[PDB]
Structure 1
Amino acid sequence: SNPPPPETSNPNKPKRQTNQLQYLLRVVLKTLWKHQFAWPFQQPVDAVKLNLPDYYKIIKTPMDMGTIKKRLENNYYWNAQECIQDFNTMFTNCYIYNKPGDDIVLMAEALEKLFLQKINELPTEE
């Protein structure tokens, strides 16, 4: 089976709306979400449907852009570095689980290039 998805709602967790977090939604997430290669990353890995029975044996910190999108639109984060870490966890998981040169790795690399381009210009905190 699949594990429960990562948390996207937790009223116990202190929250902020900051200009950096707004940029992560309006620029970073939106740029990657509309990309031709976004679709494998737009929801948690469905290891049943995709016949990857070892996926969650290997990947213990799952992350995906559907979860990130919910976290941003639900104001789940306290700071931008939390969200940046989620993106990097998503990319790292893909490189760890898969083989170099796989289509999915090429897709992650193209998304990560754009990610790096956008967070290079993360605005200074207001």
Structure 2
Amino acid sequence: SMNPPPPETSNPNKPKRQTNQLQYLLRVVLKTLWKHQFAWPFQQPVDAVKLNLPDYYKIIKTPMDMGTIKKRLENNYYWNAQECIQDFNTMFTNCYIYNKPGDDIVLMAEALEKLFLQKINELPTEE
């Protein structure tokens, strides 16, 4: 079984805007999480082929990762901050769905998520 194509990251048939919340999600939230010591497994789609996890995309039908989030922010793919926040949440929930609760990767994800939520609770007000 091969990997599915990545999530869509660019669409010209979608309206474009820059907002201070979206800027903050890229420049502060994504940047912070990306540099975190546990970020590495979440920086690109799960390569189920390379990792030998043939069951991954049988279980995870809404894949998401921070590489995809980065491209989406870069390409002005999101109109609303909540679209991006949803993608971060999808990434975390996917990890919790797929892996056993005691797995190293789950505990790593939990630490990343704690950080994520700290940065999200400080989301600047709509300018």
TM bracket (short chain): over 0.9
Which structure: greater helix fraction? Answer: 2
User: Identity of aligned pairs, percent?
Assistant: 100
Structure 1 CA distance for aligned equivalents of residues 47 and 87 of structure 2: 18
1:13-70 CA distances to partner (integer Å, 9 max, x unpaired)?
A: 1221100000101110011000010000000000001111010010000000000011
Cα displacement (A) at 1:73: 1.4
Unaligned regions of 5+ residues in structure 2, if any? none
Query: Where do 5+ consecutive residues of structure 1 fail to align?
Result: none
Partners in 2 of 1:115 and 1:7 — Cα distance? 23
Question: Which deviations, in whole Å up to 9, do the C-alpha atoms of 1:72-117 show, x marking residues without a partner?
Answer: 1111110100000000000000000000121100110011000000
TM-score (norm 1): 0.97
The 2-side partners of 1:33 and 1:116 are apart by: 14
Hey, what's the Cα distance between the residues in 1 that align with 2:16 and 2:61? 25
Q: Secondary structure at the match of 1:31?
A: helix
